[PDB]
Amino acid sequence: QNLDLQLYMRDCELAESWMSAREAFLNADDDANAGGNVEALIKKHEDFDKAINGHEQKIAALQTVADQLIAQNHYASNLVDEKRKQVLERWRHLKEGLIEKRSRLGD
Amino acid sequence: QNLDLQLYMRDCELAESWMSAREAFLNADDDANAGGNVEALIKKHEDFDKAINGHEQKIAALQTVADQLIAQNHYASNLVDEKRKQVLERWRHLKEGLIEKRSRLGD
């Protein structure tokens, strides 16, 4: 629900959608494709390399954002849990007094 | 983390403050021996049990909140991770096709 997480989800959805457009392109291509001319078999080749590259880059940036959001979540959970443990341990020492003093009332 | 986290830490702090006061009274009490007769010893003992139960109760409730916070963070991380997995798989499928249509146009 955090807006940051929301931006990331949006960004992931947008990346998927661009991928989907490319899947459709590959299909149309397969219905006709390029042409056995050297200059342009090569030009098409470079075009695929460019596509693949851009895709890979976009993927790596998203992974970077995912890593950040998860690291923030982990940090929050750790703080929460650790505070809990400190609180529980302080109770363990209170409790010890209570009970003992309760003994001392006379033994 | 944010708001929820802040309130919980404050709650824990307030709880710890309450336990510091108690443990303080205990210090006074630590000595605070004035003999005692049945009815009053008995009412002192009871008074202990009651504080012991109150404390235990606060703790339990703090625990519940900690668990909820942690569950919320786990959920969000899972959403994040899962989307990431998704993008990557969608990418793997597209890459497979780009490499295929490239190669014809290559060798």
Q: Where are the domains of chain A?
A: 1-107
Q: Is A53 on the interface with B (CB under 8 A)?
A: no
DSSP string computed for chain B: --HHHHHHHHHHHHHHHHHHHHHHHHHHHTT------HHHHHHHHHHHHHHHHHHHHHHHHHHHHHHHHHHHHHHHHHHHHHHHHHHHHHHHHHHHHHHHHHHHTT-
For chain B, the farthest-separated pair of C-alpha atoms sits apart, in whole angstroms, at 103
Rounded Cα distance, B19 and B15, in Å: 6
Is the distance from CB of A101 to CB of B30 less than 8 angstroms? yes
Tell me the CB-side half-sphere exposure of residue A79, using CA atoms within 13 A. 16
Q: Judge: B5–A44 Cβ closer than 8 Å, yes or no.
A: no
Number of C-beta neighbours around residue B4 at 10 A: 15
Cα–Cα dist B91/B16, whole Å = 51
| B77 close to A (CB below 8 A) | yes
Of A1, A66, A94, the CB nearest to B19: A94
Alpha carbon A74 to its chain centroid, in Å, reads 12
Contacts A70 to B, Cβ<8 Å: 77, 80-81
CATH no., domain B1-107: 1.20.58.60
Q: Record the tokens describing residue A13, joined without a space.
A: 């959805």
